[PDB]
Coordinates of C-alpha atoms and ligand atoms in Angstrom, one line a residue:
Chain A
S1 CA -0.1 -0.1 0.1
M2 CA 1.0 3.3 -0.5
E3 CA 1.7 5.6 1.8
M4 CA -0.5 8.0 2.1
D5 CA -3.4 5.7 2.0
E6 CA -2.1 3.4 4.7
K7 CA -2.0 6.4 7.5
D8 CA -4.9 7.6 6.7
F9 CA -6.6 3.3 7.4
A10 CA -3.6 3.2 10.0
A11 CA -6.4 3.8 12.8
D12 CA -8.4 0.9 14.3
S13 CA -11.8 2.5 13.7
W14 CA -13.1 6.0 12.3
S15 CA -13.5 7.2 15.6
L16 CA -9.9 7.1 16.1
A17 CA -9.0 8.2 13.2
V18 CA -11.0 11.0 12.5
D19 CA -9.9 14.8 14.9
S20 CA -11.6 14.8 18.2
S21 CA -13.6 17.2 17.8
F22 CA -15.0 16.6 15.0
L23 CA -16.1 13.3 16.3
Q24 CA -17.8 15.3 19.3
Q25 CA -20.2 16.7 16.1
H26 CA -22.0 13.6 15.2
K27 CA -25.2 11.7 16.8
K28 CA -24.0 8.2 17.9
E29 CA -26.3 6.7 15.2
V30 CA -23.8 8.1 12.3
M31 CA -20.4 7.7 14.2
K32 CA -21.6 4.0 14.3
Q33 CA -22.9 2.8 10.6
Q34 CA -18.8 5.5 9.5
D35 CA -17.2 2.8 11.7
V36 CA -18.0 -0.1 10.0
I37 CA -17.9 2.1 6.3
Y38 CA -14.6 2.4 7.3
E39 CA -13.4 -1.0 8.0
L40 CA -14.7 -2.1 4.8
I41 CA -12.5 0.0 3.6
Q42 CA -9.7 -0.6 5.2
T43 CA -10.4 -4.0 5.0
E44 CA -10.5 -3.4 0.6
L45 CA -6.9 -1.6 0.5
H46 CA -5.4 -4.7 2.4
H47 CA -7.2 -7.0 0.0
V48 CA -5.4 -5.0 -2.9
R49 CA -2.3 -4.9 -0.8
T50 CA -2.9 -8.9 -1.2
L51 CA -3.0 -8.8 -4.4
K52 CA 0.2 -6.7 -5.4
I53 CA 2.2 -9.3 -2.9
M54 CA 1.2 -11.9 -5.4
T55 CA 1.6 -9.8 -8.6
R56 CA 5.1 -7.9 -7.6
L57 CA 6.8 -9.2 -5.0
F58 CA 5.4 -13.7 -6.0
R59 CA 4.6 -14.1 -9.5
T60 CA 7.3 -11.3 -11.0
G61 CA 9.5 -12.5 -8.9
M62 CA 9.2 -16.2 -10.4
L63 CA 9.4 -15.0 -13.3
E64 CA 12.8 -12.5 -12.8
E65 CA 14.6 -14.9 -10.5
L66 CA 13.3 -18.1 -11.4
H67 CA 13.7 -21.0 -14.5
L68 CA 10.5 -22.7 -13.9
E69 CA 8.7 -24.7 -16.7
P70 CA 6.0 -22.5 -19.0
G71 CA 2.6 -23.0 -17.2
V72 CA 3.7 -23.0 -13.6
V73 CA 4.2 -19.4 -12.6
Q74 CA -0.1 -19.0 -14.2
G75 CA -1.2 -22.2 -12.3
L76 CA 0.3 -21.2 -9.0
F77 CA -1.3 -17.6 -9.4
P78 CA -4.7 -18.1 -11.6
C79 CA -6.1 -14.7 -13.0
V80 CA -3.7 -12.2 -10.3
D81 CA -4.2 -9.0 -13.0
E82 CA -7.7 -9.5 -13.4
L83 CA -8.4 -9.6 -9.8
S84 CA -5.8 -7.0 -9.1
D85 CA -7.8 -4.9 -11.5
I86 CA -11.1 -5.1 -10.3
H87 CA -9.8 -4.9 -6.9
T88 CA -8.1 -1.6 -7.2
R89 CA -10.6 0.1 -9.8
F90 CA -13.4 -1.0 -6.4
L91 CA -10.2 0.7 -3.9
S92 CA -9.7 3.7 -6.8
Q93 CA -14.0 4.0 -6.2
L94 CA -14.5 3.6 -2.4
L95 CA -11.3 6.1 -2.2
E96 CA -12.5 9.3 -4.2
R97 CA -15.5 8.7 -2.3
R98 CA -13.5 9.5 1.0
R99 CA -11.3 12.1 -0.2
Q100 CA -14.7 14.4 -2.1
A101 CA -16.2 14.1 1.8
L102 CA -13.3 15.8 3.4
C103 CA -13.4 18.6 4.9
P104 CA -11.5 21.5 3.4
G105 CA -8.1 21.9 5.7
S106 CA -8.8 18.6 6.7
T107 CA -6.7 14.8 5.4
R108 CA -8.5 12.9 8.3
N109 CA -12.1 14.3 8.7
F110 CA -14.4 13.2 6.6
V111 CA -18.5 11.9 6.3
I112 CA -19.7 9.3 3.7
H113 CA -23.5 9.3 3.3
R114 CA -24.0 7.8 0.1
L115 CA -22.1 3.7 -0.4
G116 CA -25.1 2.4 -1.6
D117 CA -25.2 3.9 -5.5
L118 CA -21.3 2.9 -5.5
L119 CA -21.8 -0.9 -4.2
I120 CA -25.1 -1.0 -6.7
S121 CA -22.3 0.1 -9.6
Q122 CA -19.7 -2.1 -8.2
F123 CA -22.1 -5.6 -8.0
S124 CA -23.7 -4.8 -11.0
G125 CA -23.9 -4.9 -15.1
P126 CA -20.4 -5.4 -16.4
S127 CA -18.5 -5.2 -13.3
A128 CA -20.3 -8.1 -11.4
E129 CA -19.9 -9.9 -15.0
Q130 CA -16.0 -10.1 -14.7
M131 CA -16.0 -10.5 -10.7
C132 CA -18.5 -13.0 -11.3
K133 CA -16.3 -14.6 -14.4
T134 CA -13.3 -14.6 -13.0
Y135 CA -13.7 -15.4 -8.8
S136 CA -15.4 -18.8 -11.1
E137 CA -12.1 -19.2 -12.3
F138 CA -9.5 -18.3 -9.3
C139 CA -11.9 -20.4 -6.8
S140 CA -11.6 -23.6 -9.3
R141 CA -8.3 -24.4 -9.8
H142 CA -7.4 -22.8 -6.2
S143 CA -7.1 -26.8 -5.1
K144 CA -4.5 -27.2 -8.7
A145 CA -2.2 -23.4 -7.7
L146 CA -2.1 -25.4 -3.4
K147 CA -0.5 -28.9 -5.0
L148 CA 1.4 -26.9 -7.9
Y149 CA 2.7 -25.0 -5.0
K150 CA 3.5 -27.9 -2.1
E151 CA 5.2 -30.2 -4.7
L152 CA 7.9 -27.2 -5.7
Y153 CA 8.2 -26.3 -2.4
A154 CA 9.2 -30.0 -1.9
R155 CA 11.2 -30.8 -5.2
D156 CA 12.8 -27.3 -6.3
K157 CA 15.4 -26.1 -4.0
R158 CA 16.1 -22.6 -5.9
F159 CA 12.1 -22.2 -5.3
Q160 CA 12.4 -23.4 -1.4
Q161 CA 14.9 -21.0 -1.4
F162 CA 12.9 -17.9 -3.1
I163 CA 10.6 -18.4 -0.6
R164 CA 11.9 -18.2 2.5
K165 CA 13.7 -15.2 0.8
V166 CA 10.9 -13.0 0.5
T167 CA 8.4 -14.2 2.4
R168 CA 11.2 -14.0 5.5
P169 CA 10.6 -10.6 6.9
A170 CA 8.0 -9.7 9.6
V171 CA 5.9 -7.4 7.0
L172 CA 5.0 -10.8 4.9
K173 CA 3.6 -13.4 7.7
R174 CA 0.9 -13.4 7.6
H175 CA 0.5 -13.5 4.0
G176 CA 3.2 -16.6 2.8
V177 CA 1.8 -18.2 -1.3
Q178 CA -1.1 -20.6 0.2
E179 CA -2.0 -18.0 2.9
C180 CA -2.7 -15.6 0.3
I181 CA -4.5 -17.9 -2.2
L182 CA -7.1 -18.5 1.1
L183 CA -6.9 -14.8 1.9
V184 CA -8.8 -13.9 -2.0
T185 CA -10.8 -16.8 -2.2
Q186 CA -12.4 -15.7 1.1
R187 CA -13.0 -11.4 0.3
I188 CA -16.0 -12.2 -1.7
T189 CA -18.3 -13.9 1.5
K190 CA -16.6 -11.1 3.5
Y191 CA -19.0 -8.1 1.6
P192 CA -22.5 -9.5 3.1
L193 CA -21.4 -9.2 6.5
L194 CA -20.1 -5.7 5.9
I195 CA -22.9 -4.3 4.1
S196 CA -25.5 -5.8 6.4
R197 CA -24.1 -4.5 9.2
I198 CA -23.7 -0.4 7.0
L199 CA -27.3 -1.2 6.3
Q200 CA -28.0 -1.2 9.9
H201 CA -27.2 1.8 10.7
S202 CA -28.3 3.6 7.8
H203 CA -32.4 3.8 8.5
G204 CA -32.0 7.6 8.6
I205 CA -31.9 8.7 4.7
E206 CA -34.3 6.2 3.0
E207 CA -32.8 6.9 -0.2
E208 CA -30.0 4.8 1.6
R209 CA -31.4 2.5 2.8
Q210 CA -33.3 1.1 -0.2
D211 CA -30.0 1.7 -2.7
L212 CA -27.7 -1.0 -0.1
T213 CA -30.9 -3.5 0.4
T214 CA -30.3 -3.4 -3.7
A215 CA -26.8 -3.7 -3.2
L216 CA -26.6 -6.6 -0.1
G217 CA -29.1 -8.1 -2.5
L218 CA -26.7 -7.8 -5.8
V219 CA -23.8 -8.9 -3.9
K220 CA -25.5 -12.6 -2.3
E221 CA -26.3 -13.0 -6.1
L222 CA -22.9 -12.6 -7.5
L223 CA -21.8 -15.2 -4.7
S224 CA -24.7 -17.9 -5.5
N225 CA -23.3 -17.5 -8.7
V226 CA -19.6 -17.8 -8.7
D227 CA -21.0 -20.5 -6.0
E228 CA -22.8 -22.4 -9.0
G229 CA -19.2 -22.7 -11.0
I230 CA -17.2 -24.1 -9.0
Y231 CA -15.7 -27.4 -10.4
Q232 CA -12.0 -28.0 -8.5
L233 CA -10.0 -28.7 -11.2
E234 CA -6.7 -31.4 -10.9
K235 CA -3.6 -32.4 -12.3
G236 CA -4.0 -35.7 -13.8
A237 CA -7.6 -36.1 -13.6
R238 CA -9.4 -38.0 -16.4
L239 CA -11.5 -37.5 -18.5
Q240 CA -13.5 -40.5 -16.7
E241 CA -13.5 -38.9 -14.1
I242 CA -15.1 -36.2 -14.8
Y243 CA -17.6 -37.4 -16.9
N244 CA -18.5 -39.6 -13.9
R245 CA -19.0 -37.1 -11.5
Chain B
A1 CA 9.0 -22.7 15.7
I2 CA 6.9 -25.2 13.3
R3 CA 4.0 -23.8 11.9
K4 CA 0.2 -25.1 12.5
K5 CA -3.1 -23.7 10.5
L6 CA -6.5 -24.1 12.7
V7 CA -9.8 -23.1 11.3
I8 CA -13.4 -22.4 13.3
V9 CA -16.2 -23.9 11.8
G10 CA -20.3 -23.5 13.0
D11 CA -23.0 -21.3 13.1
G12 CA -22.8 -17.4 12.4
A13 CA -24.2 -17.4 16.0
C14 CA -21.9 -19.4 18.2
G15 CA -19.4 -16.1 18.1
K16 CA -16.3 -17.7 16.3
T17 CA -15.4 -14.6 14.6
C18 CA -15.5 -12.7 18.2
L19 CA -13.7 -15.7 20.1
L20 CA -9.9 -15.1 16.7
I21 CA -10.4 -11.2 17.2
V22 CA -10.3 -11.2 21.5
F23 CA -7.6 -13.7 20.9
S24 CA -5.8 -12.3 18.8
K25 CA -5.5 -8.7 20.3
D26 CA -5.6 -10.0 23.8
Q27 CA -8.2 -7.4 24.9
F28 CA -12.4 -7.6 23.8
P29 CA -11.7 -4.5 21.4
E30 CA -13.4 -1.4 23.2
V31 CA -13.9 0.6 20.5
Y32 CA -14.8 -1.1 18.1
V33 CA -15.2 -4.6 17.2
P34 CA -14.2 -5.6 13.9
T35 CA -17.5 -7.2 12.0
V36 CA -14.8 -9.6 9.2
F37 CA -11.2 -11.7 10.8
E38 CA -8.7 -11.6 8.1
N39 CA -6.3 -14.0 9.2
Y40 CA -3.8 -14.6 11.7
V41 CA -0.1 -16.0 13.1
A42 CA -0.2 -16.2 17.2
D43 CA 2.9 -17.0 18.7
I44 CA 2.4 -19.8 21.2
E45 CA 4.4 -22.5 23.5
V46 CA 2.3 -24.7 24.8
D47 CA 4.3 -27.2 26.5
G48 CA 8.2 -25.3 26.2
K49 CA 7.2 -26.3 21.9
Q50 CA 7.2 -22.5 20.2
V51 CA 4.5 -22.7 17.3
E52 CA 3.3 -20.2 14.8
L53 CA -1.1 -20.9 14.0
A54 CA -2.1 -19.6 11.7
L55 CA -5.9 -18.5 12.4
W56 CA -9.2 -18.6 9.7
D57 CA -12.8 -17.6 10.2
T58 CA -15.0 -19.2 8.3
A59 CA -17.8 -17.3 8.8
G60 CA -19.9 -15.8 5.6
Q61 CA -19.0 -19.1 3.9
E62 CA -22.0 -20.8 5.9
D63 CA -24.9 -21.1 2.8
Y64 CA -22.1 -21.2 -0.3
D65 CA -21.1 -25.2 -0.2
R66 CA -18.3 -24.9 -3.3
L67 CA -16.7 -22.0 -1.4
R68 CA -16.3 -23.1 1.9
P69 CA -14.5 -26.1 1.6
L70 CA -11.7 -23.8 0.1
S71 CA -10.6 -23.1 4.2
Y72 CA -10.1 -26.8 5.0
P73 CA -6.7 -28.0 3.1
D74 CA -4.2 -28.8 5.1
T75 CA -5.9 -28.0 8.4
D76 CA -4.0 -29.5 11.3
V77 CA -6.6 -28.7 14.5
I78 CA -10.4 -27.5 14.3
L79 CA -12.4 -25.7 17.0
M80 CA -15.7 -26.4 16.4
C81 CA -18.1 -24.0 18.3
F82 CA -21.8 -23.6 19.5
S83 CA -22.8 -20.6 21.7
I84 CA -24.1 -22.1 25.3
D85 CA -27.1 -19.2 24.6
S86 CA -28.5 -21.4 21.7
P87 CA -29.4 -24.6 22.3
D88 CA -30.2 -24.6 18.1
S89 CA -26.5 -24.1 17.4
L90 CA -25.4 -26.9 19.0
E91 CA -27.9 -29.1 17.2
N92 CA -26.6 -28.1 14.0
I93 CA -22.7 -29.8 15.2
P94 CA -23.2 -33.7 14.8
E95 CA -25.0 -33.9 11.2
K96 CA -24.0 -30.8 9.5
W97 CA -21.0 -29.2 10.4
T98 CA -19.4 -33.3 11.7
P99 CA -20.2 -34.7 9.0
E100 CA -19.0 -32.2 6.6
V101 CA -15.3 -31.9 8.9
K102 CA -14.9 -35.5 9.2
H103 CA -15.2 -35.2 4.8
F104 CA -12.5 -32.7 4.1
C105 CA -10.1 -32.5 7.2
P106 CA -10.4 -37.0 7.6
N107 CA -8.3 -37.2 11.1
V108 CA -8.0 -33.8 12.4
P109 CA -8.2 -33.0 16.0
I110 CA -11.6 -31.7 17.0
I111 CA -12.3 -29.3 19.9
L112 CA -16.0 -28.5 20.7
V113 CA -15.7 -25.1 22.0
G114 CA -19.0 -23.8 24.3
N115 CA -18.6 -20.1 23.5
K116 CA -20.6 -17.2 25.6
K117 CA -20.7 -19.1 28.8
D118 CA -21.1 -15.5 30.6
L119 CA -24.7 -16.0 29.0
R120 CA -25.1 -19.3 31.2
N121 CA -26.6 -17.4 34.2
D122 CA -28.0 -14.4 32.7
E123 CA -31.5 -13.9 33.2
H124 CA -32.4 -12.0 30.4
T125 CA -31.2 -14.7 28.3
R126 CA -32.8 -17.3 30.5
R127 CA -35.9 -15.1 29.8
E128 CA -36.3 -14.9 26.2
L129 CA -34.7 -18.7 25.8
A130 CA -37.9 -19.9 28.3
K131 CA -40.3 -18.7 25.1
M132 CA -39.0 -21.5 22.8
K133 CA -39.9 -24.0 25.4
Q134 CA -35.5 -23.5 26.3
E135 CA -32.7 -23.0 28.7
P136 CA -28.8 -22.6 28.5
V137 CA -26.6 -25.5 27.2
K138 CA -25.4 -27.4 30.0
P139 CA -22.4 -28.6 31.1
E140 CA -22.8 -31.8 30.8
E141 CA -24.7 -31.7 27.3
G142 CA -21.7 -29.5 26.0
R143 CA -19.3 -32.7 26.9
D144 CA -22.6 -35.2 25.7
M145 CA -21.9 -34.3 22.0
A146 CA -18.4 -33.1 22.0
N147 CA -18.0 -36.9 23.2
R148 CA -20.6 -38.2 20.7
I149 CA -19.1 -36.1 17.7
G150 CA -15.3 -38.0 18.8
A151 CA -14.5 -34.9 19.9
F152 CA -10.8 -34.5 20.3
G153 CA -12.4 -32.7 23.8
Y154 CA -14.6 -30.4 25.5
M155 CA -13.9 -26.9 26.0
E156 CA -16.0 -23.4 27.6
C157 CA -14.8 -20.2 26.8
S158 CA -16.6 -15.9 26.7
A159 CA -15.1 -13.7 24.3
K160 CA -16.6 -11.1 26.5
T161 CA -14.9 -11.6 29.7
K162 CA -11.7 -14.0 28.2
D163 CA -12.3 -16.1 30.4
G164 CA -11.1 -19.9 28.9
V165 CA -10.2 -18.1 25.4
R166 CA -5.5 -18.5 26.2
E167 CA -6.5 -22.3 26.9
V168 CA -8.7 -23.3 24.3
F169 CA -6.1 -22.3 21.5
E170 CA -3.0 -23.6 23.4
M171 CA -5.3 -26.6 24.1
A172 CA -5.7 -26.5 20.1
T173 CA -1.8 -25.9 19.6
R174 CA -1.8 -29.0 21.2
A175 CA -4.0 -31.0 19.5
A176 CA -2.5 -30.1 16.3
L177 CA 1.1 -31.0 17.6
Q178 CA 0.4 -34.3 18.3
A179 CA 0.6 -37.2 16.2
Ligands
LIG1 C1 -23.5 -7.5 10.5 C2 -23.3 -7.0 11.7 O1 -25.4 -7.0 12.3 N1 -23.3 -7.2 13.2 C3 -21.9 -7.6 12.7 C4 -21.2 -7.3 13.9 C5 -20.1 -7.5 15.0 C6 -20.1 -7.2 16.2 C7 -20.7 -6.1 16.7 N2 -20.3 -6.0 18.3 C8 -22.2 -6.1 16.2 C9 -22.4 -6.3 15.1 C10 -23.4 -6.2 14.3
LIG2 C1 -19.8 -29.6 1.9 C2 -20.3 -30.5 0.8 O1 -20.2 -30.8 -0.4 N1 -19.8 -32.3 1.0 C3 -19.6 -33.2 0.3 C4 -19.5 -34.4 1.4 C5 -19.6 -35.8 1.7 C6 -20.2 -36.7 2.7 C7 -20.1 -36.0 4.1 N2 -20.2 -37.5 5.0 C8 -20.4 -35.0 4.4 C9 -20.3 -33.9 2.5 C10 -20.1 -33.0 2.8

């Protein structure tokens, strides 16, 4: 993550991120809504950061330092550029909504009143079709990526040294290859609980409550569609095993 | 320090997300209780053995049967959670969660955890449950369910007061270290 965004999201909550004199100006219900929106954006920033570790540190490092067989790096990190494109764009939109809302003269004091529309746009039309297509492909390749990783770590000396070298720093503690893959698979099923809790504290403006109710339904539809399009690919699985599924 | 993987399973009302948060912070959040848990690698020393225990939540995956099993590969210990203020969470253990975990995690130890033990003697909980001809889960009911499902052990904790939380994760580490 870039320093500007890391510092903007360093606090444990929105109530601790904003100045105390600004916090005092809002009703309890607004602070509750704002803390949950802040958690959605902060976790999105961390998810984008996980995708940058996978593309820049892992994938690109293996291409530039290792002599693996063709199709191996792609097998390890399926759809990583498409996932990074979907979420970097979604993160840009969330950060721009926060930026426009800042008080003049402040880089930390803001209130986001209109998240629903942004969430409807992300989880509908072409962007939803691309999310559905990408996660259906990624989650169906999850087991194959893990098995390919385990095999390479156990049998390839230079691959093992590469992994131990780039995952040694403490800031990578939670972000080994397999941990990154599961963090990404689990991301999409975090959206309904974040959105429902934001909706819980967004009854003040009827149009906002309606837009978040629509967004929640679109997210659940996306998850149901992705879940229905999954079948784990297996390296070595014969056609007979597949058509007798 | 050897690396082990822990996954917590159970109904959403079992308080699994809260349990992982309170353990990983060694504090019940005073300002904001997070809606979600990403992952965490806890440094634990149990009986003189140092372990890095990776923690994972399954909250949000309950209605997605093809997404949910993706959390299970290479799991070393399962925490099967239910809430003491909810007899309905305990009923979903033997024929929903238990057969799933035994299929995707064969021979992996399971610790059955009774969460929210601080609500067993809560007057508001007792009055609310009596409306559905129910009452808080009794300690023997938890032990009998753990015995029946072939659990490694039975434990209770409170994420609210922190009582028993550390013990659950130190025991999960011992179970993950076993042959
Ligand atoms: C999804 C939702 O409505 N919620 C998630 C929560 C997490 C913690 C808490 N104290 C309340 C919550 C309420
Ligand atoms: C969730 C899922 O796909 N499952 C497949 C199973 C096969 C056998 C069994 N006892 C439980 C299962 C659970």
